[PDB]
Design a protein around this ligand. Sequence first.
Ligand code: NAP
Ligand code: DDF
Length: 159
Amino acid sequence: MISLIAALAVDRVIGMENAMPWNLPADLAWFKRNTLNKPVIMGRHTWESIGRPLPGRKNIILSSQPGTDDRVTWVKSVDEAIAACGDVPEIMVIGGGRVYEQFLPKAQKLYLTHIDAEVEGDTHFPDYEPDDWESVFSEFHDADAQNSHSYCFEILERR
Ligand SMILES: NC(=O)c1ccc[n+]([C@@H]2O[C@H](COP(=O)([O-])OP(=O)(O)OC[C@H]3O[C@@H](n4cnc5c(N)ncnc54)[C@H](OP(=O)(O)O)[C@@H]3O)[C@@H](O)[C@H]2O)c1
Ligand SMILES: Nc1nc(=O)c2c([nH]1)NC[C@H](CCc1ccc(C(=O)N[C@@H](CCC(=O)O)C(=O)O)cc1)C2
């Protein structure tokens, strides 16, 4: 199945590396935890922002242009991206906006981190009908010495 994983600020603003202020090792640990040894599908801008393949994961990059890095697998359509994952239990789509929009209809799971921040941003996580999703897990954390904002992990499952 297909899952999306995202960090959402207020108004469900999303962004790239440099745009995202917070320092949530807790959130990056959550990401690592939930994506490890699963294929990750991302759009070209997200790829360029991360700057290096995620280790121990198959990295699949969407782009309309031929690939420019032999360290990752390049694909030119959603269906090709899915095919390039082979037969795994769970495919992780790690953004960005354009990619989340295309994969949401296909997804069965959302892993969201709701961050208590207003950030500069126009790019938002896709709107999804709440009627089609059930929250099955959530866990709130206050900011601390090594995490800058409060945040809440959430997992939703498609009914
Ligand atoms: N300055 C501003 O006001 C502003 C506002 C909004 C966003 N932004 C910028 O937007 C970028 C992030 O956008 P995003 O989150 O939407 O990026 P993203 O999803 O991570 O990457 C989008 C790219 O993925 C590829 N892609 C996606 N779907 C595809 C498909 N079906 N077939 C082939 N290729 C596909 C395309 O690459 P190719 O281009 O290679 O085809 C597309 O440009 C950042 O660089 C951010 O700075 C800036
Ligand atoms: N939960 C969550 N938080 C986020 O900040 C993001 C998402 N999801 N989803 C999409 C995008 C992911 C951007 C993104 C992903 C991974 C790394 C990265 O390098 N992760 C390492 C751990 C970082 C470290 O070593 O400190 C990893 O191996 O997973 C950086 C940026 C932003």
